[PDB]
Design a protein around this ligand. Structure first.
Ligand SMILES: [K+]
Ligand SMILES: [Mg+2]
Ligand SMILES: [Mg+2]
Length: 98
RNA sequence: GAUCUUCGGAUCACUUUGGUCAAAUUGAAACGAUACAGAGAAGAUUAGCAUGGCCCCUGCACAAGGAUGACACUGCGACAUUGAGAGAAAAC
């Protein structure tokens, strides 16, 4: 059944994936791009577990009056994958248009 | 110096310099000519009025003229891709 349920997910989206307006196109493009995302590397879990042991005050997930979220400077790999993803999307657009 | 005053002094008047810049090749403009093309509307000849502004010229002009003054008048991708097949690859 599990294989059929996987096919049920396929057919449900296949009839749901088959231009109307910009408002709906926004969400469709966004989650289509999300489908190509590969999250959850070794950075996030270490960040969650390490400074929480010495969390004297405020939480790492607290954002009511946090200040360090202004100065989040990412690493090389993340911005590299960003440029590569945007380049791939541009390639897809230019191969689709003509 | 003039006036008094009494030979102590008092009156009267009191600070310039119009500077596109020191006697003209090298800090007031704008070009002649020769050589090239060489006069708007989808055949041909040709009326014009406009639109745009780091383009102006003549004019006292918010008239009007200067070739309808001249130049300009186009053109592209917030396209989602799936619709499918095939050989591969890694995968139903
Ligand atoms: K004419
Ligand atoms: Mg005129
Ligand atoms: Mg004109």
């Amino acid at each position: 059944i599990e294989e059929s349920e996987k096919w049920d997910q396929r057919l449900r989206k296949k009839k749901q994936t088959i231009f109307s307006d910009y408002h709906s196109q926004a969400s469709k493009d966004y989650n289509r791009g999300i489908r190509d995302l590969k999250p959850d590397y070794e950075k996030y879990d270490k960040d969650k577990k390490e400074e929480k042991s010495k969390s004297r005050s405020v939480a790492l997930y607290d954002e009511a009056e946090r200040l360090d979220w202004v100065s989040n400077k990412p690493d090389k790999e993340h911005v590299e994958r960003l440029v590569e993803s945007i380049k791939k999307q541009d390639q897809r657009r230019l191969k689709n248009t003509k």
